[PDB]
Design a protein around this ligand. Sequence first.
Ligand SMILES: Nc1ncnc2c1ncn2[C@@H]1O[C@H](COP(=O)(O)OP(=O)(O)CP(=O)(O)O)[C@@H](O)[C@H]1O
Ligand SMILES: O[C@H]1[C@H](O)[C@@H](O)[C@H](O)[C@@H](O)[C@H]1O
Ligand SMILES: [Mg+2]
Length: 273
Amino acid sequence: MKCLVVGHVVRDIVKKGNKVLERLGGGAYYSALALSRFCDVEILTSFSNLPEEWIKELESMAKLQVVPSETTTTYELTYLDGNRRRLKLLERASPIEELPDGEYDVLLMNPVAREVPPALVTSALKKFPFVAVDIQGFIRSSSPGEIQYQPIDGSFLKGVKILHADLGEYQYLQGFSPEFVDVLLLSNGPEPGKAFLHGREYTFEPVHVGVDESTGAGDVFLGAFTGFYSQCPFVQALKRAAAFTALFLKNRSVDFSMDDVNELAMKVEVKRV
Ligand SMILES: Nc1ncnc2c1ncn2[C@@H]1O[C@H](COP(=O)(O)OP(=O)(O)CP(=O)(O)O)[C@@H](O)[C@H]1O
Ligand SMILES: O[C@H]1[C@H](O)[C@@H](O)[C@H](O)[C@@H](O)[C@H]1O
Ligand SMILES: [Mg+2]
């Protein structure tokens, strides 16, 4: 199984109380990280400078296809509480305007700052047989500074197999209903989420875990779900995605056994409404 994940990798400047660190980030990184546990991954991205050790982490999990750039997408993430963060765009890498040809079983589009046009999703749906999308990088302004949401028309998503948005983001998706996609994952941090299978609503309860930051969890959840959904029934896939993302949150290396994911997946509550 061979997957292409599309989006900018990000230099995260992460601020948590009085502490400051830098770390690799981005939808494409975190979704690839999760999918690396299921198949061969290639990442189509753009960046200019990254730390040698970060290029090494990315290359140990995937093949990189990098659109040349003078700049690296850089986000300051100021976490007031564990899930609540202010996101500020400080710098942005190049647009991703061209897809590669190849035997890609799955394409997962996870931009973070408007680098993938909706036209490219349209092109992907024609060139490839299975498209997954996170909406986050389609509804943020690309303008410098504090992120602002701009609504978009959602008819271009018709044909997408799996779509993830959080509660707040979903409100910015207009002309949309869940049946446009095969699976709509509507998350809400540690709080109950929704999942829709051909429009049919379910609820799900994440397992409780105490985080100081949530960075990447929605990307991991989307990537993990995409992986399990290819090998499990819908409900089980959703449980295992949840457990996977719970484990990730306390083990960002994601080097835990898949057996550990399966045992904990059983304790995850899922109901057809
Ligand atoms: N505090 C927490 N405890 C346990 N699971 C959590 C969690 N926060 C997130 N998760 C899991 O990850 C999923 C996606 O998280 P979330 O809804 O926060 O993604 P997001 O894209 O909206 C923002 P972020 O990537 O910063 O988390 C949740 O549905 C849940 O299963
Ligand atoms: O590292 C992160 C993470 O990948 C988020 O899911 C994304 O929305 C942010 O912009 C990025 O800084
Ligand atoms: Mg997200």
